Design a protein around this nucleic acid. Structure first.
Length: 177
DNA sequence: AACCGCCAAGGGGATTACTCCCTAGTCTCCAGGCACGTGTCAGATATATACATCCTGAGCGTAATCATGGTCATAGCTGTTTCC
C-alpha cells in the first residue's frame, strides 16, 4: 500500500472517493480540493506526512500542485477520461511527463477521437522510452493507407495493440440487458 | 469578473509565377506665364460732430443705528386679619 495518484474531472471527484469508500475502505484517499491556503494544510500535514495511499485531484490542481507532487514518487498515475492529453501541447501533458511512477495507467471512456496522430499522443506517454518518436510512428503506418486505401496494413496496427490494449463494449456483455 | 487553458476552423497574410502597359527618357515645338511698363483707385490722411460712456457725486432711498416711550415685573410698604 503506497503512494497513488488519480485524476478526475471536477464534476467527478466525488464519485471516485465515494466508490473507494463503498468497496475498499482500507485505502487512504483525499479529494485534494480547496483554496490556496486550504490546499496547503493538505500539503504539509498529510501529503508531506506520507499519510495516504491515493490522492484524488482535478485537471488543474495537479498543475497548481506540480512542485509539491514531484518530490513524491508514485506507483501509477491513474488518468480517468484522458481527453486533455490528446494535445501534446496541452499543458497537462508536460506536467505528467515529469513525474516518476513505476506504472502509468491511462483510462478513458471513449477511444481516440479523430486521428492517428492523436492515437500515439495517448500512446507516446504510455511507454515513452520505447517510442521517443513522433512522426516516426506516423509515417510508419501512413494513416490507414491514406493513399492506397489497402486497409490491410491496419491489421498491423490492430495486431500490436490487441495484446497491448483492451476494448469491451456494453452491447456484448450487457450488464443492463 | 479577470486569468488562464482549452478547443477547433476559417481567414487572410504570406509566397511564387507571370504579364503588361504605363511611366520613364527623349525630342520636337510654342504660347503661357513671367518679367516689364503705367495709371488709377481705395486705403490713407486729416477734421468735425455725434455719441457712448465713465466718473463722481447731484441727489435719493434705504437701512442701520440711536433715541425714546411704554409696559410689565418685581419689590417695598402698609393695612388687614387672626391669634395669643
Amino acid at each position: 500500500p503506497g503512494p497513488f495518484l488519480v485524476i478526475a474531472p471536477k464534476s467527478t471527484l466525488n464519485n471516485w472517493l465515494r466508490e473507494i469508500n463503498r468497496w475498499t475502505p482500507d485505502v487512504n484517499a483525499f479529494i485534494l480540493q480547496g483554496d490556496k491556503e486550504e490546499r496547503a494544510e493538505l500539503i504539509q500535514k498529510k501529503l508531506l506526512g506520507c499519510d495516504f495511499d491515493v490522492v484524488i485531484a482535478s485537471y488543474e490542481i495537479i498543475i497548481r500542485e506540480k512542485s509539491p507532487l514531484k518530490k513524491i514518487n508514485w506507483e501509477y498515475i491513474i488518468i480517468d477520461e484522458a481527453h486533455r492529453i490528446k494535445n501534446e501541447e496541452s499543458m497537462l501533458s508536460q506536467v505528467l511527463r515529469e513525474f516518476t511512477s513505476r506504472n502509468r495507467l491511462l483510462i478513458t471512456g471513449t477511444p481516440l477521437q479523430n486521428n492517428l496522430h492523436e492515437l500515439w499522443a495517448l500512446l507516446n506517454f504510455l511507454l515513452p522510452d520505447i517510442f521517443s518518436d513522433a512522426q516516426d510512428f506516423d509515417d510508419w503506418f501512413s494513416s490507414e493507407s491514406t493513399e492506397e486505401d489497402q486497409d490491410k496494413i491496419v491489421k498491423q496496427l490492430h495486431t500490436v495493440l490487441q495484446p497491448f490494449l483492451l476494448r469491451r463494449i456494453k452491447s456484448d456483455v450487457e450488464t443492463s440487458l
